[PDB]
Amino acid sequence: YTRTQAQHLFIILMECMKKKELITVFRMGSEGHQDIDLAILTALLKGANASAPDQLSLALAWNRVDIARSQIFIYGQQWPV
Amino acid sequence: SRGKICTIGIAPWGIVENQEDLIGRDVVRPYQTMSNPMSKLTVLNSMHSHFILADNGTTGKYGAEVKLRRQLEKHISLQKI
């Protein structure tokens, strides 16, 4: 596919896999989030490294109530006063 | 669905989140349902149609109602249908 093992992108790929915290992978049947619009929107909330009120404001802006129902409002959130 | 279930909840008095807001006798008392984790206490679970609060003077410790609940069950089992 590339210039053999003479030149490879393996080091950069391994660096990306070292930074794999943000990677989200879709796959039919094998994993959950079979809906792309569900999967593409969960990435913004998870990867923002924001607190619960910030993600709640994001869900209010996007007018998607099911995501805030199933992701934001779960056990153990500890909203500020 | 219609109908009501006569759910009876026997709880230790020393673990409620509000020792106050419940002193009023033969009157209606509002009660908050939002639960916060820095109080080291637990709120009364809603839609329990009857509550029995048992106290032995302590505050924040369990074990104050198991004897009462067991004796009440035994006495009910001796009642005649």
Q: Which of B19, B9, B31 is nearest to B59 (CA)?
A: B19
DSSP type of residue A70: I
Q: Which of B53, B46, B72, B51 is nearest to B12 (CA)?
A: B53
What length is written for chain A?
81
Q: How far are the Cα atoms of A25, A26, A33, A34 from residue A30, in angstroms, in the given order? A: 11, 9, 10, 9
Cα–Cα distance, A70 to A75 (Å, whole number): 10
Q: Which of B18, B14, B9 is nearest to B55 (CA)?
A: B14
For the beta carbon of residue B12, count every other beta carbon within 10 angstroms: 20
Cβ neighbourhood burial of A35 (10 Å; 0-12, 13-18, 19+):
exposed
Cα–Cα distance, A13 to A7 (Å, whole number): 13
